[PDB]
Design a protein around this nucleic acid. Structure first.
Length: 35
RNA sequence: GCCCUGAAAAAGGGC
């Protein structure tokens, strides 16, 4: 189809969403900033 | 068949 294909074009929407939605991404997979 | 929206590995929508 074209949507499933468009999803590959959504990697920017996914990586932008995934970047701010780790909570909805692999439980226990949230980065932090306190070394 | 082509997309668009959804983050989607839902749900949706237009042509």
């Amino acid at each position: 189809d074209a949507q499933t294909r468009r999803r590959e074009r959504r990697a920017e929407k996914q990586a932008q969403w995934k970047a701010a939605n780790p909570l909805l991404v692999g439980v226990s997979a949230k980065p932090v900033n306190r070394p």
